[PDB]
């Protein structure tokens, strides 16, 4: 793998999606920009269990963007607190969680319909990543735009402990073009997004296992 002509990123233990989420052990890759992404077979995650029902398209899109360029946008989420600490996903000496998502639960044991809205003012497309926290008793989620309703229903049900946390953080993606206005509604446990990732128009991704070296 040559370095001089094209920008490579490698990654000890980060799958491209894990760097996208900002897993605590892969947090060093924030805001990184690349031309080609390269993936170790050692890749593993230490946070909450998770699953992207459209893994392939998300991988291709993020790789083609060639940038994370995250920017916190200060969504309202005023009704309840946006931080959440899990026994897994340890980062440091205490509990932690993804660095690009929220684990809302609901303060005062009540979850009002949040009805969050965020206008996409910029001239370039934006991508917002959110999830649904399948527990292990009530709640429905919907991410609405001018083109789709990414309806999701929390698939409640018991499950096997995977990292001492019997649940899932199923992750979806949402494009929000200029002029369109993201709309979000909820009734229960929602993995509230923290901010968009920019998209930039010939980068790609290759799953090579060659060593790392400095050469042309």
């Amino acid at each position, epitope marked *: 793998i040559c370095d001089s002509p094209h920008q490579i990123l490698d990654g000890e233990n980060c799958t491209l999606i894990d760097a996208l989420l900002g897993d605590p052990q892969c947090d060093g890759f924030q805001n990184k920009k690349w031309d080609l992404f390269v993936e170790r077979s050692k890749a593993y995650s230490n946070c909450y269990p998770y699953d992207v029902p459209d*893994y392939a398209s998300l991988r291709s899109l993020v790789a083609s963007s060639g940038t994370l360029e995250f920017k916190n946008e200060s969504f309202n989420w005023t009704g309840v607190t946006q931080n959440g600490t899990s026994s897994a996903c340890i980062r440091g000496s205490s509990s932690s969680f993804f660095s690009r998502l929220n684990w809302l639960t609901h303060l005062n044991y009540t979850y009002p319909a949040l009805n969050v809205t965020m206008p996409n003012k910029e001239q370039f497309d934006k991508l917002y990543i959110w999830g649904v926290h399948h527990p292990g008793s009530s709640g429905r989620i919907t991410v609405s735009t001018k083109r789709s309703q990414q309806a999701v229903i929390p698939n409640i049900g018991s499950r096997p402990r995977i990292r001492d946390i019997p649940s899932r953080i199923s992750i979806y993606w949402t494009i929000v073009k200029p002029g369109d206005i993201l709309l979000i509604n909820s009734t229960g446990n929602l993995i509230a997004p923290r901010g968009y990732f920019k998209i930039r128009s010939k980068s790609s991704i290759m799953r090579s296992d060659a060593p790392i070296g400095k050469c042309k």
Partner: antibody
Amino acid sequence: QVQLVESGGGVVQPGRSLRLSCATSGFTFSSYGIHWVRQAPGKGLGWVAMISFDGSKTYYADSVRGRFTISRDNSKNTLSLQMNSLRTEDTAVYYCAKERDRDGYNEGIYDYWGQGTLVTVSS
Amino acid sequence: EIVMTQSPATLSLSPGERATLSCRASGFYLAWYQQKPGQAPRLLIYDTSNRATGIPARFSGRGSGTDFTLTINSLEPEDFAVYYCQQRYNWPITFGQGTRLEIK
């Protein structure tokens, strides 16, 4: 070193009560969650039962749901899979398998096994 | 519980050749298990792409989207056995129906 032995298998008429015993040695029995796995002659494996960690929970499989009563006594380090209402689909070897982490942290991963006891049901 | 399928029940290949194993189920926690004929199975893989203790690096797991795969870059006589793909998401753990590697 840790080792597992299955016992009590053999021939029993359908519907008769049966109880395997899977003892353990080389580690404190509360250190892991126990399991049971089966395979009939010439077919693929299948799941049977489970105790999560320290015996406050149990979760069986579909085809055998409700029939069995897996239980343990932490003061003697002994496992048992109490069996009721045997049926002709239950001809197979029964392993008692452990997992690769303590107290329950990755449940669903097995590294240690016994030899596997044969249980046969027929006239 | 998911209905987990696997590659053809028997794949015949000569030692040293490259092999691939499929476990299309329709993303994570699909540990594989190795059993030698007449032996209690043993752990080979503990996640879609991570190897357990002692396994040679020749075995490599990849794939995602309920379309996982296990590619063997070079077979060895000890590799000719039965391989079952597990799955941990949801309570009922359903091993695949299994497949056999035979010395061609």
